[PDB]
Amino acid sequence: MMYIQVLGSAAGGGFPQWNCNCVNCKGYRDGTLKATARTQSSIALSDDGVHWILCNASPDIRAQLQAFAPMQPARALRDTGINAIVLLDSQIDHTTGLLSLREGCPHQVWCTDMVHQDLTTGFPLFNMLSHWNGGLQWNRIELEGSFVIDACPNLKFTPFPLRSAAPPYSPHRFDPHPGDNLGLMVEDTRTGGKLFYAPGLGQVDEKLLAMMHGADCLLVDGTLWEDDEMQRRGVGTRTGREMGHLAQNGPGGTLEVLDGFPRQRKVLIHINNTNPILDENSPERAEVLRRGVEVAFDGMSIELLEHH
C-alpha cells in the first residue's frame, strides 16, 4: 500500500489568491460560487501511514501539516511525521515551506544538483538553515536511475526530466539545464503499484506516454482549462506554454491525452485559481467527471493498492 495525501491542490497563489478578484476568487469570497479553498500544491507519500515523504514544501505548509493528523504522531514532546522532503524544482512556491520547518532540523532533502545550486545561491535556503541544528542534509537526485528514501523503504522513486525553466531569481534563469525540473514515478516495490506524478507538465511525447501507460494512477497538471486563461479572466498576460502548463481543453490538451488511458486512475492537481473546474457547478467540471477524471482537493487521500 502506497498512501498519497494531497496537502495542497492549487497552483501558485492558491485559491482564492490573495490579490485576485477574478470570477472564481471573487465568487468564492462573496459566497456566490460553490467552490472549496485550496492551498498551494504539495503531496505526502508513505508506505506505512506513519513515515511520510513530503513532495514540495509549500508556503502554506503550516496549515497543511496541521490539517493532516499523521503529520503529528505525538511520540515525543517534539515530533513530526515528516521523514524527508523531495523537491521537484527550486520555485518559491515549492520550497518556501522549508523555512517554517527550521526548528525541526536536520531534515533530509532530496533535490537535483541544479536545484541545490539555486538553493545555495539565489534563494539560499540551505545556507540559511545551516544555522539551525545542522540544517538541511542534501541528498542528490541523479538525472538517471532511481532512489529509495530509507524511512519508506518500499517506495522506489524514478524521476523523469521535464523541460527546464529555472525560476526568475535563479543565477541560471536564462540558461536552463537538465535537472531544473522533474516529475516522479513512484513504485511500491511490494505490489508494483505505480504513481505517475507530474504537477507541472508542459508537453507530452512518446516516451512520456509510454511511462504513463505503465502506471496505475496519473496525478497530473490541472493548471489551466485554456492556454490563454489568465488573459480571459483579465488577471494576467502569461500563457500556459509560457508557464510550462498544458491546458485541459483543446487539441493536444491533457483531456485529449488522458482519453488514451481508460484503465488508470486520473486526477488533476495544481489547479490555478482561474480554472473553471474549481467551480463545482461549471460545465467544465461536469466534463471532467464525464471523462472519469477527478479534480484534486485539499485533504484528498489516494490509496494505491496494487498494480493493474
46 binds, among Na ion, its own copies, Zn ion, none (CB under 5 to 8 A by kind): none
Q: Using CB under 5 A, which of the segments 7-15, 62-70, 184-192, 217-225 binds Na ion?
A: 184-192
List CB contacts of 20: < 8 A, sequence separation 6 or more. Answer: 13, 235, 273, 274
Nearest-approach distance from CB 307 to Na ion, in angstroms: 8
- Pick from 25, 87, 186, 302 the residue near Zn ion by CB under 5 A: 25
- The DSSP result for 80-128, as a single string, is -SEEEEE-SS--HHHHGGGGGGGGG--EEEEE-HHHHHHTTTTS-HHHH
Alpha carbons 240 and 77: distance in angstroms, whole number: 46
Alpha carbons 188 and 195: distance in angstroms, whole number: 9
Q: Output phi, psi for 277, to 5 deg.
A: -65, -15
Residue 211 and residue 192 in contact, taking contact as beta carbons nearer than 8 Å? no
Nearer to its own copies by Cβ, of 242 and 306: the residue is: 242
Nearest-approach distance from CB 121 to Zn ion, in angstroms: 32
Nearer to Na ion by Cβ, of 257 and 304: the residue is: 304
- Pick from 89, 93, 226, 227 the residue near Cu ion by CB under 5 A: 93
188 binds, among Zn ion, its own copies, Na ion, none (CB under 5 to 8 A by kind): Na ion
What letter represents residue 203's amino acid? Q
Nearer to its own copies by Cβ, of 96 and 254: the residue is: 96
Nearer to Zn ion by Cβ, of 10 and 182: the residue is: 10
- Pick from 93, 188, 226, 229 the residue near Na ion by CB under 5 A: 188
List CB contacts of 207: < 8 A, sequence separation 6 or more. Answer: none
Could you tell me the CA-to-CA distances from 54 to 8, 103, 107, 118 in Å, in that order?
11, 17, 11, 20
Nearer to its own copies by Cβ, of 49 and 234: the residue is: 234
Q: Does 8 bind its own copies (CB under 8 A)?
A: no
Q: Does 31 bind its own copies (CB under 8 A)?
A: no
CA dihedral in degrees (292, 163, 196, 179; nearest 10)? -160
Quick count: other Cβ atoms within 10 Å of Cβ 76?
7
Nearest-approach distance from CB 224 to Cu ion, in angstroms: 12
Which of 188, 187, 199 minimizes the C-alpha distance to 158? 187
Q: Does 32 bind its own copies (CB under 8 A)?
A: no
Q: Name the grid cell of 208.
A: 512520456
66 binds, among Zn ion, Na ion, its own copies, none (CB under 5 to 8 A by kind): its own copies
Residues composing the chain: 308
- Pick from 51, 57, 59, 194 the residue near its own copies by CB under 8 A: 59
Q: Does 14 bind its own copies (CB under 8 A)?
A: yes
Nearest-approach distance from CB 139 to its own copies, in angstroms: 21
Tell me which residues in 209-248 interact with its own copies (CB under 8 A).
Answer: 233-235
List CB contacts of 210: < 8 A, sequence separation 6 or more. Answer: none
The alpha carbon dihedral of 240, 244, 246, 247 has a sign of negative
285 binds, among Zn ion, Na ion, its own copies, none (CB under 5 to 8 A by kind): none
Residues that bind its own copies (CB under 8 A): 13-14, 16-22, 26, 29, 37, 59-63, 65-66, 71-72, 74, 76-80, 92, 96, 99-104, 122-124, 127-128, 131-132, 168-169, 173, 233-235
